[PDB]
Each structure stands twice: as structure tokens, then as C-alpha cells.
Amino acid sequence: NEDNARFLLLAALIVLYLLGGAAVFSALELAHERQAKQRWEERLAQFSRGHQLSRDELRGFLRHYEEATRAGIRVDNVRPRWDFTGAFYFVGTVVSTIGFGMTTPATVGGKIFLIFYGLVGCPSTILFFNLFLERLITIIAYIMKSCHQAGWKPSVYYVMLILCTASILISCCASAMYTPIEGWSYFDSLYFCFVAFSTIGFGDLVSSQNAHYESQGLYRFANFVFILMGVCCIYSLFNVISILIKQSLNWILRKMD
Amino acid sequence: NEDNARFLLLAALIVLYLLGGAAVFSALELAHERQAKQRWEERLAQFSRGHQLSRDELRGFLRHYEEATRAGIRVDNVRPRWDFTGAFYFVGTVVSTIGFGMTTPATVGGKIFLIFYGLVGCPSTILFFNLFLERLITIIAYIMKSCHQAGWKPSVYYVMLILCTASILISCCASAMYTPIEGWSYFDSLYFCFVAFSTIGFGDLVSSQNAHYESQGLYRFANFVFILMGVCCIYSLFNVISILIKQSLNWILRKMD
Numbered sequence: 001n002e003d004n005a006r007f008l009l010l011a012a013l014i015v016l017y018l019l020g021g022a023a024v025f026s027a028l029e030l031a032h033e034r035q036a037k038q039r040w041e042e043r044l045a046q047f048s049r050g051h052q053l054s055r056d057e058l059r060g061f062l063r064h065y066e067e068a069t070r071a072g073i074r075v076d077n078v079r080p081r082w083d084f085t086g087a088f089y090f091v092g093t094v095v096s097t098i099g100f101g102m103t104t105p106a107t108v109g110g111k112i113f114l115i116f117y118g119l120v121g122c123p124s125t126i127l128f129f130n131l132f133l134e135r136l137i138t139i140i141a142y143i144m145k146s147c148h149q150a151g152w153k154p155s156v157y158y159v160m161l162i163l164c165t166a167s168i169l170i171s172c173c174a175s176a177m178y179t180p181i182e183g184w185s186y187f188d189s190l191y192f193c194f195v196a197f198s199t200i201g202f203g204d205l206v207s208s209q210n211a212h213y214e215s216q217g218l219y220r221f222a223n224f225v226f227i228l229m230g231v232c233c234i235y236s237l238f239n240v241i242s243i244l245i246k247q248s249l250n251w252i253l254r255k256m257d
Numbered sequence: 258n259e260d261n262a263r264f265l266l267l268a269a270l271i272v273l274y275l276l277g278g279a280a281v282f283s284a285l286e287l288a289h290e291r292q293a294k295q296r297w298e299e300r301l302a303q304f305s306r307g308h309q310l311s312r313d314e315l316r317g318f319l320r321h322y323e324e325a326t327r328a329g330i331r332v333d334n335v336r337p338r339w340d341f342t343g344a345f346y347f348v349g350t351v352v353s354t355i356g357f358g359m360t361t362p363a364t365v366g367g368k369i370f371l372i373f374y375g376l377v378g379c380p381s382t383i384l385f386f387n388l389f390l391e392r393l394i395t396i397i398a399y400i401m402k403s404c405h406q407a408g409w410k411p412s413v414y415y416v417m418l419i420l421c422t423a424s425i426l427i428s429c430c431a432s433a434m435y436t437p438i439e440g441w442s443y444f445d446s447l448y449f450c451f452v453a454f455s456t457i458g459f460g461d462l463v464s465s466q467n468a469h470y471e472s473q474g475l476y477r478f479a480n481f482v483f484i485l486m487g488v489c490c491i492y493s494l495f496n497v498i499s500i501l502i503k504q505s506l507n508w509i510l511r512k513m514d
């Protein structure tokens with residue numbers, strides 16, 4: 001009966017969390033949204049009036065441009081899709097369950113292969129992350145024992161603090177490279193790092209997509225390394241926080257009578 | 258030395274997997290990509306000649322349209338963002354790490370809150386999925402014991418088969434709708450189900466945004482239920498497959514001496 005009670009309590013807490021978050025986000029974003037929509041409508045009206053065009057023609061043109069944009073066409077000089085390097089980027093985003101969406105299959109045959117490829121490849125990456133976490137815990141224990149100088153395993157709190165510090169350092173080091181090379185601010189770089197590392201992958205900000213990219217040989221390698229390390233660290237941090245949340249739920253159940 | 262060897266072997270296998278997958282995907286998709294680009298170029302040239310507009314003016318108009326699209330505007334009628342139910346959909350996509358990208362924060366203050374909200378909310382959903390898997394295993398053992406009529410826990414193989422059957426049934430039941438209600442083909446519905454359930458979330462196909470949606474009260478509830486069950490089942494299946502892959506890695510290590 002304890003497991004059922006814990007399950008029900010967690011479900012209720014998540015429901016309340018979702019409701020509160022929805023209210024807060026709506027209150028934060030509604031005015032901005034409405035203002036942006038009004039600005040777009042004014043711009044569209046001005047363009048239509050200036051060049052004496054018709055709305056239906058503009059709707060057809062925009063539908064064609066929407067089709068072209070899913071094909072892959074952009075307005076500022078993007079790198080080609082479905083070359084070997086682009087395919088490598090795509091499969092890397094697939095196996096990590098990031099799913100930026102900048103590149104998607106469009107043919108029958110590439111979607112069946114997409115399904116089978118993901119079905120065979122995502123568990124391997126999950127196992128790799130688990131093995132990385134185990135190795136990191138072992139090396140942390142060994143380092144601590146050597147510094148003090150088996151039974152020297154660190155507690156969960158210290159592992160959480162170390163993972164937080166590592167994540168902060170990795171994010172600030174990746175941002176220190178993203179900000180100059182891209183046209184991004186430091187806060188935007190940190191936001192992109194958080195969105196990519198947590199495997200949410202909104203897709204609004206994607207790096208390394210500007211055709212000629214200066215040196216472009218070391219830059220792609222550095223991007224790959226940074227994303228890999230960040231994803232590993234954030235995965236481990238989330239697992240530790242989940243363990244702590246389970247302990248807190250147990251305490252909440254015990255206190256209530 | 259066994260753990261290091263297993264880590265190295267898994268890394269090498271994943272690297273080879275990525276290379277082969279990139280080569281296959283590129284060979285599958287390059288011709289379609291080139292044909293789509295040529296079609297878009299021809300359409301743009303025909304519009305330009307049709308109405309004698311200069312290229313730069315069209316580039317500016319398309320940049321404005323991209324900015325508008327980043328705020329939610331589409332050529333078809335779509336539901337509003339951030340009212341109260343769009344926010345609920347957004348937070349649901351956030352906590353499950355799906356990240357469709359149809360709705361993203363655009364203000365300073367909504368991005369800090371996004372970071373903290375995700376940091377506190379993703380581990381809770383991970384814990385919920387783990388508890389669901391434990392409860393499912395327990396109930397499966399109970400049903401098996403009752404049918405035969407503690408030590409009656411099923412093997413990993415049978416759990417994998419049952420999870421596969423449940424995933425297929427849930428996908429087919431969800432695809433029974435989504436097909437007439439949204440103009441989608443059955444194969445497209447199955448592809449969308451796989452992409453959403455695995456928490457990849459490309460965002461090319463997103464369900465339940467067409468402004469007026471007939472009943473629209475029961476339909477949203479059914480969509481919520483279907484996505485929740487599918488994500489749970491696919492998460493459990495991936496964990497079981499990861500366990501099997503680890504066993505296979507141990508076997509190949511033993512064979513290589």
C-alpha cells in the first residue's frame with residue numbers, strides 16, 4: 001500500500017506543478033506574443049499595400065516557402081543537408097534523443113530505417129551514459145582516497161555538488177567559444193547549452209550551421225566533444241536529483257498521518 | 258580492466274554504427290534533397306518574374322516572415338499560444354523532455370524560469386516512469402501467478418515481448434484516430450507515434466493544433482492519455498533492450514579472450 005500511495009502522491013504533485021507552471025508561463029508570455037502577432041500583421045498589410053499584390057497570392061507564395069523551408073532552404077547561407085557530415089550530425093542528434101529538427105527524413109524508406117535505427121541505437125547510448133556515470137563515481141572515490149592518504153565511496157550530496165560544478169564549468173567554457181564565433185550573447189549561449197544538454201532540443205538555436213565556418217576542421221570536433229560531455233554530466237545530475245526527490249517523497253509520506 | 262575494456266568496446270562500436278548510419282542516410286536522402294532545392298529555386302524565380310519584385314525585397318519579406326513564424330504565426334489556422342491550454346501543452350512537452358519546439362520562450366525571465374522549472378521537473382518524471390515500470394512488473398507477476406493457479410517473477414525476455422506487444426497495440430489504437438481527424442495517413446500516424454513516444458520530438462508532425470477541433474474537449478484528454486501511455490511503454494522497452502545489449506557485450510568480451 002506504500003507503493004500505491006507514493007505513486008498517487010507523485011501523480012498529484014506533478015499535476016499541481018503542471019497547473020502552476022502553465023499559469024506562470026502564460027502570465028509571462030501572453031503580452032509579448034500578442035505584440036509580435038500585431039507587428040507581423042502590420043508588416044504584412046504594409047507589404048501588400050505597397051506592391052499592390054493580393055492576399056491569396058501571398059498565401060500561396062508563403063505556402064510554397066513553407067514547403068521549401070521543410071525541405072531545408074533558409075535565408076542566410078546554411079550548410080548542405082544529407083552530405084556525409086550532415087548525415088553524421090543527424091545521426092548524432094538522433095541517437096542522443098535530442099532531436100533538434102533541423103534535418104528530418106522526407107521519403108518512404110528513410111522513415112522505416114529511421115524507426116529501426118532509433119530502436120536499435122537509443123538503448124546503446126543510454127547504456128553508455130550509465131557506464132560513464134559508474135566510471136566517474138569510481139574515479140572520484142579513487143581520487144578522494146589518494147588525496148586523504150573500496151570503502152571510500154562519496155555520498156550522494158557530494159556527487160551532486162561535483163556534478164553541478166562540472167556542468168557549470170563545461171557550460172561556461174562552451175559559451176566562451178560559442179559567443180565570439182556565433183552572433184550570440186553570453187546568456188543566449190548559456191540558454192542553448194542548457195537546452196541541448198538536457199536533451200530537450202527545442203531547435204530554436206542550433207550551432208555549426210553557417211556554411212563557410214573559418215577553420216571548420218577543429219570547430220566541428222570541439223562542438224562534438226562539448227555536446228557529448230555536457231549531455232553526460234546533465235544526465236548524471238538528473239539521476240542524482242531524482243534519487244533525492246524519491247527520498248523527499250518518502251519523508252513526506254512518513255510525516256503525514 | 259574488464260570495465261575499461263567494455264567501455265572502450267562500446268565506444269568503438271557506437272562510432273562504427275554512427276559512420277555506417279550516416280553513409281546509409283546520405284545515400285537514401287541526397288537525391289530528394291537536391292530535387293526539392295531545385296524545385297524551390299524554380300518557384301522563387303517564377304514568382305520573381307511573375308511580379309517583377311527585386312530579390313532583395315523578397316529576402317527582406319522572407320526574413321520578416323521567419324521572424325513572425327518564430328512567434329507562432331502559420332499559413333493555416335492554429336490554436337493560440339500561452340492562453341492557458343497552450344501553456345499546459347508546453348509544460349507537458351517540457352517535463353517529458355520531448356521538446357517539439359512548436360512553442361518556445363522568447364523573453365528574458367521566461368528563459369531563467371524555463372531553466373529552473375526543467376531542472377526541478379525532469380527528475381520527477383523520470384522517477385514516475387521508474388515507479389510505473391516497477392508497478393507493471395509486479396502486476397504482471399501477479400497475473401501470471403493467478404493464471405497458473407514471490408518467486409514467480411517473469412524473465413527479461415518475456416517482459417520485453419509483452420512490452421513490444423503493448424507498444425504495438427497502443428500505437429495502432431492511437432493511429433486509428435489521428436488518421437481521419439487530422440488528414441494523416443496511417444503510416445504517417447505510426448511514424449508520428451514512434452517519434453513522440455521515444456521522446457525524440459523532431460517537431461515536423463505535431464498533433465492537436467487546428468483551432469476549432471469539433472468536440473475539442475474529449476479529444477485533448479484522449480491525446481494526453483495516449484501520449485502518456487506510449488511514452489511510459491517505450492521508456493520501459495528501451496531500458497530492457499539496454500540490459501540485453503549489456504549482456505551481449507559481456508558475451509563478446511568473453512569470446513575475444
Ligand SMILES: CCCCC/C=C\C/C=C\CCCCCCCC(=O)O
Binds near residue numbers: 095096
Ligand atoms: C566516443 C563515442 C561515444 C558515443 C557517443 C554518443 C552519442 C553522441 C552524442 C552527441 C551528439 C553530438 C552532436 C554531433 C555533432 C557533430 C559535429 C558537427 O558536424 O558539427
Ligand SMILES: CCCCC/C=C\C/C=C\CCCCCCCC(=O)O
Binds near residue numbers: 342382477481
Ligand atoms: C496523471 C499522471 C501525471 C504524470 C504526467 C507526466 C508527464 C506528462 C507527459 C506527457 C504529456 C504530453 C503533453 C500532452 C498534452 C496535450 C493536451 C492538449 O492537447 O491540450
Ligand SMILES: CCCCCCCCCCCC
Binds near residue numbers: 085
Ligand atoms: C569532423 C569529424 C566528422 C567525422 C566524425 C569522426 C571524427 C570525430 C570523432 C572520432 C572519435 C574516434
Ligand SMILES: CCCCCCCCCCCC
Binds near residue numbers: 342345474477
Ligand atoms: C482539457 C484538459 C485541460 C487541461 C488540464 C486537464 C487536467 C485533466 C487531466 C488530469 C486530471 C487528473
Ligand SMILES: CCCCCCCCCC
Binds near residue numbers: 173176177180181
Ligand atoms: C579550455 C578551453 C576553453 C577555452 C576556449 C576559449 C575559446 C575562445 C576563443 C574563441
Ligand SMILES: CCCCCCCCCC
Binds near residue numbers: 215218219222
Ligand atoms: C578558432 C578556435 C576554434 C577551435 C577551438 C579549439 C579547441 C580545441 C581543443 C578542445
Ligand SMILES: CCCCCCCCCC
Binds near residue numbers: 430
Ligand atoms: C480504444 C479503441 C477506440 C479507439 C479508436 C476510436 C476511433 C476514433 C475515430 C472514430
Ligand SMILES: CCCCCCCCCC
Binds near residue numbers: 472476
Ligand atoms: C471523436 C473521438 C473522441 C475521443 C474518444 C475517446 C475517448 C475515450 C478514450 C479513453
Ligand SMILES: CCCCCCCC
Binds near residue numbers: 004008011
Ligand atoms: C487504487 C489506486 C489507483 C491509482 C490510479 C492512478 C491513475 C494514474
Ligand SMILES: CCCCCCCC
Binds near residue numbers: 084
Ligand atoms: C570527410 C572526412 C571525414 C571522414 C571520416 C574519417 C574517419 C576516420
Ligand SMILES: CCCCCCCC
Binds near residue numbers: 135136139261
Ligand atoms: C581510468 C578511468 C577513466 C575515466 C576517464 C573519464 C574521462 C572523462
Ligand SMILES: CCCCCCCC
Binds near residue numbers: 218221
Ligand atoms: C581536419 C582535422 C581533423 C581534426 C580531428 C582529428 C582528431 C583525432
Ligand SMILES: CCCCCCCC
Binds near residue numbers: 261265268
Ligand atoms: C586507458 C583507458 C581508455 C581511455 C580512452 C578514452 C575513452 C573515451
Ligand SMILES: CCCCCCCC
Ligand atoms: C482540475 C480542473 C482544471 C480545469 C482547467 C481549466 C478548464 C478550462
Ligand SMILES: CCCCCCCC
Binds near residue numbers: 392396
Ligand atoms: C495495483 C495497481 C496498479 C495499477 C497499474 C495501472 C496501469 C495503468
Ligand SMILES: CCCCCCCC
Binds near residue numbers: 474475478
Ligand atoms: C470538457 C470535458 C472534460 C473532459 C475531462 C474528463 C475529466 C476526467
